[PDB]
Ligand binder design. Sequence first.
Ligand SMILES: CC(=O)N[C@@H]1[C@@H](O)[C@H](O[C@@H]2O[C@H](CO)[C@@H](O)[C@H](O)[C@H]2NC(C)=O)[C@@H](CO)O[C@H]1O
Ligand SMILES: [Ca+2]
Ligand SMILES: [Ca+2]
Ligand SMILES: [Ca+2]
Ligand SMILES: [Cl-]
Ligand SMILES: [Cl-]
Ligand SMILES: [Cl-]
Length: 535
Amino acid sequence: RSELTIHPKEFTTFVRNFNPFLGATNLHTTTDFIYEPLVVFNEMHGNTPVFRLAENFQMSDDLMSVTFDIRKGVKWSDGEAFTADDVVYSFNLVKEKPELDQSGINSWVTGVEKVNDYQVKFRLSEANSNVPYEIAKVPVVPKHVWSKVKDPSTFTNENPVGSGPFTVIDTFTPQLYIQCENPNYWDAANLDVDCLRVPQIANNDQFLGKVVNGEMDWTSSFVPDIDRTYAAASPKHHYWYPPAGTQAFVVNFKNPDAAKNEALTNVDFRRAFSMALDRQTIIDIAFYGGGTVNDFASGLGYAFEAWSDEKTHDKFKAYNSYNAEGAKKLLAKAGFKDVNKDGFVDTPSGKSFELLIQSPNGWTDFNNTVQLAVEQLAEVGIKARARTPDFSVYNQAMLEGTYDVAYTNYFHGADPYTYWNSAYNSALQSGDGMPRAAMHFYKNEKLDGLLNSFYKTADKQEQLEIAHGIQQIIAQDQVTIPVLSGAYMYQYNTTRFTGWWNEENPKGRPNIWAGIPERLLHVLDLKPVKLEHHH
Ligand SMILES: CC(=O)N[C@@H]1[C@@H](O)[C@H](O[C@@H]2O[C@H](CO)[C@@H](O)[C@H](O)[C@H]2NC(C)=O)[C@@H](CO)O[C@H]1O
Ligand SMILES: [Ca+2]
Ligand SMILES: [Ca+2]
Ligand SMILES: [Ca+2]
Ligand SMILES: [Cl-]
Ligand SMILES: [Cl-]
Ligand SMILES: [Cl-]
């Protein structure tokens, strides 16, 4: 039997938890691989829908409702029948318990109803023509189970009943678990992989040793000097790094320290911070050239240059370009003066301060970015130092607003909305299932208004104009400090399997992370290599 060795997420130890709604504590082979979505949107290729457990969808009248045609003939892993009430239950479960909304679905779908056994209708809080994409983000769980569970909020779901291709827990150790083919998988014919083999790997260092020794199949980790360390180790070691989303330094607007709050809430300081940074050098040293300078004050990025209002871009690009003397003169003009002779600037009220900059433990490319930033900042007289907390500590500090500055990446869509909405919609700064992206706690009502209306009208020109408005608001206030546009790191080994996506076969986002539903489509294309013979 063919075992595919994947690595979606670092863990120090595996804790059995396959609850699809617990993204911050579950195992990361749960969405897609255990719970198949209704539709997979191919984000790299214009968000083209690939219909899965749903056959078709159709929006309404006024962009204010939608129906999904549930495919019949689809059975759960236990034997039961995938139907509309599963969808129905699932969506009610998220409105009842908004802790389980990881997407923001509850601010869109205002109710959900079983048209019949194979059709569901959703009604909206407002016109959003992109709401089928949002709808697809919600996990759909078997009603004949989850309805009767004590607390879904804490159900660890250790023997999952799933619709996806890999639902069987074959083995489970704290250092290894193997996930095996659903015996009622509807697309079983298309599937040529037996099992998912998930080893426990805690950081990029432990990962490095395995991957260069040919021990992995499908991974998406950072690999330093990848040509001379991994590519050079075997001709079987391949990779494909298509362009990804924005990475930025995010500053806390609600920092509880008086002195730090005084610096971070000041647009002149954020701009000076930004001008102190040498973006291309960060890309070259920390990422070994694997990235693109982002000198958009709005964070838009060169992948979306087509969307860009070039007036706005040019007006603020100087604040987002390496210029240490410019940084120093801005600090002086703004009044951040060193008044206690240590060479580091103090706030307008005369207070000394040091910025603690955080990135997740083990994410070494980001750790080294922060450390380059600390030195670049010191050259213009801004005192800072690095911290590398465990991801969950890192994440919590942002949700709780206790951090000073955080370096982070964002999810990346087929248009600027995925980035701009997740990074700036102030509604996403509240709610316990919310990711870290918006947690700068900068709030602008006009901005939320523009974000909320982006898919409200089918006018391509008007929509572009809304994007110009968003771009201008964010750039003027230098809300974050955008640094670069990164890559979808992806490594594959041709030793044991074939059919991989790559430059000559770019079928979609190739990565194995949770939050890349396309990985479901990717594993279906994979096929074992004929290595040995019968007798
Ligand atoms: C948008 C987002 O948050 N993506 C997360 C990934 O960045 C993250 O992958 C990790 O990315 C680090 C930063 O480049 C890498 O150094 C690290 O190797 C990589 N880890 C793995 C296992 O690929 C993943 C997993 O932590 O979570 C994504 O959501
Ligand atoms: Ca296939
Ligand atoms: Ca098969
Ligand atoms: Ca000082
Ligand atoms: Cl901009
Ligand atoms: Cl484009
Ligand atoms: Cl366009």
